[PDB]
Structures are given as structure tokens and as C-alpha cells.
Amino acid sequence: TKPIVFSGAQPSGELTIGNYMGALRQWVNMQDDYHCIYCIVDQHAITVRQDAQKLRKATLDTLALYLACGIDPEKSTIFVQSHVPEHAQLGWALNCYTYFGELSRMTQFKDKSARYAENINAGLFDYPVLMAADILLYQTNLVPVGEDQKQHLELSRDIAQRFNALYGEIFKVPEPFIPKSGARVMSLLEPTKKMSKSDDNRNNVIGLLEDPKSVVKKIKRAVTDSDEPPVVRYDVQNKAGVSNLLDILSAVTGQSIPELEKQFEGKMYGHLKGEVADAVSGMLTELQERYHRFRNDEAFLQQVMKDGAEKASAHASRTLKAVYEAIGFVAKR
Amino acid sequence: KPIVFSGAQPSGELTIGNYMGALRQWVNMQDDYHCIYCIVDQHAITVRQDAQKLRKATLDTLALYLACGIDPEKSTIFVQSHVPEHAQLGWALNCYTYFGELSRMTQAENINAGLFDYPVLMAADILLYQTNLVPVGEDQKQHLELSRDIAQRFNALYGEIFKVPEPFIPKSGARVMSLLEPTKKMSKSDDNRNNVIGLLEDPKSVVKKIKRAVTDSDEPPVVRYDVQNKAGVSNLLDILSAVTGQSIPELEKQFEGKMYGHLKGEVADAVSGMLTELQERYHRFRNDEAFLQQVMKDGAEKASAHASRTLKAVYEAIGFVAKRH
Ligand SMILES: Nc1ncnc2c1ncn2[C@@H]1O[C@H](COP(=O)(O)OC(=O)[C@@H](N)Cc2c[nH]c3ccccc23)[C@@H](O)[C@H]1O
Ligand SMILES: COc1ccc(N)cc1
Secondary structure, three states: OOOEEEEEEOOOOOOEHHHHHHHHHHHHHOOOOOEEEEEEOHHHHOOOOOOHHHHHHHHHHHHHHHHHHOOOOOOOEEEEHHHOOHHHHHHHHHHOOOEHHHHHOOHHHHHHHHHOHHHOEHHHHHHHHHHHHHHHOOOOOEEEOOHHHHHHHHHHHHHHHHHHHHHOOOOOOOEEEOOOOOOOOEOOOOOOOEOOOOOOOHHHOOEOOOOHHHHHHHHHOOOOOOOOOOOOOOOOOOOHHHHHHHHHHHHHHOOOHHHHHHHOOOOOHHHHHHHHHHHHHHHHHHHHHHHHHHHOOHHHHHHHHHHHHHHHHHHHHHHHHHHHHHHOOOOOO | OOEEEEEEOOOOOOEHHHHHHHHHHHHOOOOOOEEEEEEOHHHHOOOOOOHHHHHHHHHHHHHHHHHHOOOOOOOEEEEHHHOOHHHHHHHHHHOOOEHHHHHOOOOOOOOEHHHHHHHHHHHHHHHOOOOOEEOOOHHHHHHHHHHHHHHHHHHHHHOOOOOOOEEOOOOOOOOOEOOOOOOOEOOOOOOOHHHOOEOOOOHHHHHHHHHHOOOOOOOOOOOOOOOOOOHHHHHHHHHHHHHHOOOHHHHHHHOOOOOHHHHHHHHHHHHHHHHHHHHHHHHHHHOOHHHHHHHHHHHHHHHHHHHHHHHHHHHHHHOOOOOOO
16 A cells, blocks of 8 residues: 555645745645645634634635646545544543643744634643644544644654653654645745735735736735845845745746756746746636636535545554554444 | 433542432432433543553543443443534634633643533533433532523523522532541542542451541540541441441440440441442443443433434534534
8 A cells, every 4th residue: 555645735725826835835746645634624723713614615715726726536545634523522531641841842833823812722732732633543644734734743653652652653744745846835915924825915925826927916015125236146145025935936947946047047036926926927817717616616626525434444543443443542333 | 300410520530428318319219300310521621641551541440430320221331432512512612611710610821621611511411412400519619600600601692591400409428528537528639548448448448448447545445426526437327327328326226235346347248248249340330342432332322312402402502514424
């Protein structure tokens, strides 16, 4: 059997080009090479307060977006996290093998606590343990994610190793698959801050479902630097905005930064931004064209969810059975 | 019938205080209330434990509750981990529980997240079954209050999804104090086991512990009820009264001109009389694996039917896409 790939994305906000480059791009390319399982993590989404209609709609939007990107339900298992109870079950169990200090030290918890001070909830704190349960359920070998998830992934490995050391070979110890370029796409008006699907300032973000024209305007307005003459060179410290543009272009086209630097020799930021806008306006038009075909077909979306949850539960129940046996629960018969 | 929820720890080493106090009280109210008994194995693992002993303890607890008179045809008794809805609701309620509320629970960075987060699981345990009443001790009053606050908070956002649970106020009335410390209650959590009489102790063990029990230096020795001045003797009277149903004034008359030796002898004989009938039932149930499996299956099946209905409403309110069956 093939090694197993697992990853997920929250149905909250509107997925950005950041989410595509750091994760979904890789998800599509891994489908034949590995046994791939992709999840819409609605249980993680509710750690941030959403309107009920928006949550339901965003779950289906996200599903249709996976499909529009090229995630093929004939190759990959595609499911909604809440449809498989084993995530919640293993998540509770793994709380007992996770230290408080490991969760309080998390960057994401700290960033999210500052952003949502009126709702610093227990789910936001316990976030990484459920995420570990998501991965560990499927005997996952590889986890394609953006750089912002490295810390969460490190904890999952620690939990797997710690549990295995007491009980035997129950889990696989997963490995991150973070891409060389586009692992952490930055904000267009604030290139020192990660591009967030929940920025109020829309201008920071390139939406996967935002109007391309509005997106082309966003690239042209992206902040660069005061260098005289302007030079297209990679330097995240002194040229954050230009570097982010080079990183985006590299990730979309598959060309290296040193290659792109040679390509823009004697050129300035107008050329860079023309070429970035071109490459991105292109992906989105195509992507949004596949999207509606999927998104307006409720019977097909219902079928993908049904089939995917079936496949997922078969794997997850198998692992949870072994976990429950090992910790000492009386088996349900 | 109001719905009553109790969580039973699979590790508790139950005493005659537990039995003649709350347990016997509740055995005689299984037709008055819709009683739920949940053996809380997911709570147990917040303390690291030997796996095989936890499995054994789950079944020991089930058999002991059955032996004490919990009737699986009247009440619902089941193992927590057999009903996935507990963990499911637990996670959802984490998202409507403040971090501060958990930090302020009467608790540095080396405690496991389960020990930190279990009050939310407790809330889920109760709220799943539309629980009206929860019989708690003083030590779990804070947890009940949190579950009431979570229920009201969720209902204010989404409509009346949960019942707001109430404490069960009336106490059993059977008083049972520690043998070497008559001022303190006999507790299943006592490190000093000479203070307690476990429900599975044999007649020789009970004799030894009752013989050792503290009594005053009154001269002449007198068997009279007086908690302030004769705590130990009064405890022995209360235990004997609880066992036989004879009133304190009846026992005071029964022991007129008798020393503390004769009282201790009668207390030991009385308690062991009670424990022998209970132990016969326990071992009969406990050694019948097929009967225990059937009780767990039926109970989980009953619990799940109810729990799934609540969780479906919870899931609909939050806005999750409904599962495709
Ligand atoms: N500006 C950016 N540049 C590049 N990559 C980015 C950018 N912003 C986000 N990402 C990546 O996109 C994925 C989805 O984002 P989420 O916020 O839903 O990502 C999250 O919140 C996860 N915890 C969801 C999750 C839950 N359980 C899991 C198990 C395995 C893997 C992932 C998960 C992520 O991989 C994230 O790293
Ligand atoms: C009681 O809170 C929890 C927390 C996490 C999970 N997965 C289940 C229940």
C-alpha cells in the first residue's frame, strides 16, 4: 500500500492565494504518488465564532474549491471533519498525552488570542490536539502544509512518539511537506505579516474567489521599497514586498528565484508586477470557471461527502480501536 | 420523569459511606426519575494508569453498581467511551467555554491537557441527555456551575437546545465518618485506608478496622450519641443505625450498661452482614462476562439514541453540514 498523505483546511474566511501555494497546490500534485486524504476541518473552524449560515456555506465553498483545484474524488478521499466522530474521540484521548505547557507555548494560540480577545475559548487553546488527532487517525506519513503549521506538526510528532513509546506501534510519526517557495505568502500592503484569509483589509489578500480584475489592481498597489534604482532582487529583510512578489511568481510558474532574478535584470517593479498579475489573474479565472460547475451541483457535492466520509471512517475506526485497546478501555461490541 | 445524570469513576474504591449514603438513596428512586449512570473511562485517563487495570476497574465498577441494586431495565448504565457523542459534544462546547473559566477552576505547565479540559467533557456528559438534575458533592459544585453557564450561553445564541441542569439538593441522611478521624467524613478518596470500610472487605478485615476505631475516654464508658464530645462512639451508632434501620434512641437503650467492645462487635457483625449479601451479588455479576457485555451494549444503545438527538440539534444550530448516511 502507498504511504498516506493527510491535510486539511478550515471553512472560515475565504481561502487565499496563500492557502493555495502553501497547501492546496501540493495536495493536487501528490494524488497519484501517495494515498491522499483531504479534510474540510469544520470543527477547527468553530474555534473562531462564525454565523451558522456562513459556516455551512463556507464548508461547501471549500469542498467545491478542492474540486476546482483538481482534487479528484476518484483518487483522493475528501470529507468533512465533523462527519467522522473519531476525530473528536481521538482528540479527547490525546489531550491526556499532551502537556499544558506545549499548548500555551503555541504561536498560533497567542496570535489568535490577540485578534479575538473577546473569545479566547478552550477550543482555540486545545486546537493543536484535535489537529494531531486528525493526522494520527489515518496512519499519516506526509502532511502538506504551509510554514505557519510547522509548530502544530512538531507537536503531532511528539504526541505520536510519546504515545508509541508507552503502547507500541499504534501511530505513524508524520513528516511535514512544506514547499520550497510559497510556503508563507505575505500580505500585499504589509509584507512583514503573513497573508491571512481573515484580514478585514481585503487589499492585503488575493482571494481564490475574488474577482481577478480586483486582484490585478491589488498586485499593482502592493508595497515594494525605496531602492534607487529599483532592482528585482530577493532580500526579505530590506525588500520584503519585492521578495514576496518573486516568491509568488516562483511558486506559480515553478521557476527558481535566482532564475527570476536573471530574468528581471535591468527591469524594474512594473515588469515584476505585470508578470505576477499575469500568472495569478490566469490561475484564478480558470479556477473560478471549474468552481461554479462543482459548487452549484449539490447532488455531486453530497455524493463526494458521503463517499469520502465512508472511506475515512474505515481508516479512522481501525486506528481508534487500537488506541482504545492500548489505553485500556473496554471495547464496544 | 426528570432526567438524572451521574458519572461513576472506574477506579473509585467504594465505601459503606458511598453505599448507605448516596447509592442506597438512588437505588430506591429508579422509578421516580429517569436515571443515567455513566462509567467515566474518558475522565479516568486524565490520570496516567495501567491499561489492564483500567479495563478491569471499568467492569468491577459496573458489577458493583449492579450489585448495589442499579437495575439496567429501569435505569441506563453504560461506559462513557462507548458513546462517541460525549467526545463530539465535548469538542463543540470547548468552543463556547472561556479559557479563563478553566484556568479559574480550583487547580504548573506539566499537567496534561485532559486534566485542564475535563470540566468541559463533564458539561457535555450532562448536557447530552437533557439532564434536569445532577447529584454532586461539594468538590464538583464548580463543575456543575460551569455546565449551567455553558448551557445558558449556548442557548442564548442558538435557542433552547439544552436543559439547564440543577443540583439534586436533598442529602441521603446516612452519616458515616472516618474511623480514626471521627470529625471527617468517610471518603472513597482517603489515602489512609484504616479510616474507611470498602464494600469488598471480608468479615476479618471489618472486625480489625472497627476494633481500631477511635472512641472517647469517658468513665464509665457510655454508649450515648454526642457528636461534639463523643465523636467516635456516635459514628459507631450512626453506622449501626444506617445498617439496621434502628433509631439512635433505640440503640442507646439497647447498649445501656454496655462497654465500647460490645458496640464494636455489633457494628462489625452488622456491616459484614450487609456486605456479604452485596458481595454475593457482585461476584455473581462480575464473573458473568456475557451478562456484563449485554448490559453495556443495551445501555450504550439507549444512551446513543438520546445523545445523538441532542448532538444533531447542537450540530444544526452551529451550522455544520449534516452527515450523509
Ligand atoms: N499566507 C500563507 N502562505 C502559505 N500558506 C498558507 C498561508 N496561510 C495559510 N497557509 C496554509 O494553508 C493551509 C490552510 O490554512 P488554514 O488556516 O485553513 O490552516 C489551518 O488552520 C490548519 N490548522 C488546518 C488543519 C486542521 N487539521 C489539520 C491536519 C493536518 C493539516 C492541516 C490541518 C495550511 O496548511 C496553512 O499552513
Ligand atoms: C471535552 O472537550 C473535548 C476536547 C477535545 C475533544 N476532541 C473532545 C472533547
